[PDB]
Design an enzyme around this catalytic site. Sequence first.
Site, PDB file in Angstrom:
ATOM      1  N   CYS A   1       0.855  -1.195  -0.076  1.00 60.15           N
ATOM      2  CA  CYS A   1      -0.025  -0.103  -0.028  1.00 60.15           C
ATOM      3  C   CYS A   1       1.070   1.391   0.126  1.00 60.15           C
ATOM      4  CB  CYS A   1      -0.872  -0.094   1.098  1.00 60.15           C
ATOM      5  SG  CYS A   1      -1.850   1.499   1.246  1.00 60.15           S
TER       6      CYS A   1
ATOM      7  N   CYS B   1      -0.203   4.218   2.492  1.00 58.29           N
ATOM      8  CA  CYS B   1      -0.530   4.006   3.786  1.00 58.29           C
ATOM      9  C   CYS B   1      -0.249   2.904   4.121  1.00 58.29           C
ATOM     10  CB  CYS B   1      -1.897   4.637   4.383  1.00 58.29           C
ATOM     11  SG  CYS B   1      -3.313   3.636   3.054  1.00 58.29           S
ATOM     12  N   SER B   2      -1.200   1.576   4.290  1.00 59.76           N
ATOM     13  CA  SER B   2      -0.698   0.459   4.914  1.00 59.76           C
ATOM     14  C   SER B   2      -1.679  -0.630   4.485  1.00 59.76           C
ATOM     15  CB  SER B   2      -0.543   0.462   6.419  1.00 59.76           C
ATOM     16  OG  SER B   2      -2.007   0.994   7.005  1.00 59.76           O
ATOM     17  N   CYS B   3      -2.851  -0.371   3.476  1.00 60.72           N
ATOM     18  CA  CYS B   3      -3.829  -1.209   3.206  1.00 60.72           C
ATOM     19  C   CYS B   3      -3.124  -2.662   2.823  1.00 60.72           C
ATOM     20  CB  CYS B   3      -4.575  -0.723   1.984  1.00 60.72           C
ATOM     21  SG  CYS B   3      -4.997   0.971   2.309  1.00 60.72           S
TER      22      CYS B   3
HETATM   23 FE   LIG Z   1      -2.770   1.729   3.245  1.00 60.11          FE
END
Ligand SMILES: [Fe+3]
Lengths: 197, 211
Positions: free
Chosen positions: A101, A104-106
């Site tokens: 991601c 961000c961190s998905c």
């Molecule tokens: Fe993310």
Amino acid sequence: ENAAPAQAPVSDRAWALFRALDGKGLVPDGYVEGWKKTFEEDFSPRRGAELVARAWTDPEFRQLLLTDGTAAVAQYGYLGPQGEYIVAVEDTPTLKNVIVCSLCSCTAWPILGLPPTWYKSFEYRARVVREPRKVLSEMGTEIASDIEIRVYDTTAETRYMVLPQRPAGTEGWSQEQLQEIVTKDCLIGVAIPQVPT
Amino acid sequence: MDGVHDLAGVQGFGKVPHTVNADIGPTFHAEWEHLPYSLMFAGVAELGAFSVDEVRYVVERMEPRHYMMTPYYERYVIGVATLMVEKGILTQDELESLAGGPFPLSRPSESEGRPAPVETTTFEVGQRVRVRDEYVPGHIRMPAYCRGRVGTISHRTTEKWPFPDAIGHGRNDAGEEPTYHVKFAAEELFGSDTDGGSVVVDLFEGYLEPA
Ligand SMILES: [Fe+3]
Ligand SMILES: [Mg+2]
Ligand SMILES: [Mg+2]
Ligand SMILES: [Mg+2]
């Protein structure tokens, strides 16, 4: 110039946020504690490993997992927050898949677990999209020049898991034996399942 | 928003701090770290105060140097706190009083967002598409590396979701759109300066046009 702003210790800020909301009756009894338990104990790469081992030994399930990941995952009851629309991506002798991601961190939380610190790092977020071969090499995974690397950037609601190739030397293994070698890093795509010498 | 959070393709970073199958430790490395996500869900599911998209956007709105020096979970503490203040649920005064010190928040938004696009196309698997050459100052789920670039549809989602550029600002006009897995050749995105093969970006219908 360019200095960090003054900030109270992060623990004090985080608990202040909790207390401000809780003191106004806005957080149900045991609410954050329940989420902590879900995050720690339920959302787990052991689930993704179970799915991979099943796909490896059940051609029919493998086809379902690759065409309707959501339905396949639902059979196990493993749908959940950040894991409601699932797509599994198939490694082949000429294709290695990797997930990130960049924004961000998905992460497919319920079946991979919450993302590890390294997956959320600026290094991984910046680099794997542009130089995945070098990143994987540095991480300990050598991908030959002829294998296409495909990076899936998790930019919307699709949540991904990698279905790695089943390694030689596992013929006839039970689902439990196969699960053991499918790690979190295999599901993200930065590692290949390893068979003991 | 062309913020520092749009990191894909940035050059100059060192090694990823991991080797395969290394110990990553417990899920939470400090006793507060479960709070940002849990309180996000309180805000979304219990209070109905904001969407997950609004959380992504408020983190994007951290002052850029502040973003770059802040650990991941702390960015979400700051983001959720900012939303609670912006929505009138909490005050910064009470947060700082409880924290016993400064609690700087994300910066105010400089865009009201934009509606779900009026004119879009339903694309089919195998079709060539180009990412619209558009600049959006508010929230958008299009990393800059693919803006204006051409790729092929590998998947159209069977579900639809609110347009991030609208819901991320709490607007009433986010509608619903499917997203598309768009496969780009590495060379389309980075010319000769890549060692990869392909990159698949999951793009809302409203970010795309026929090639
Ligand atoms: Fe993310
Ligand atoms: Mg076999
Ligand atoms: Mg046996
Ligand atoms: Mg940029």
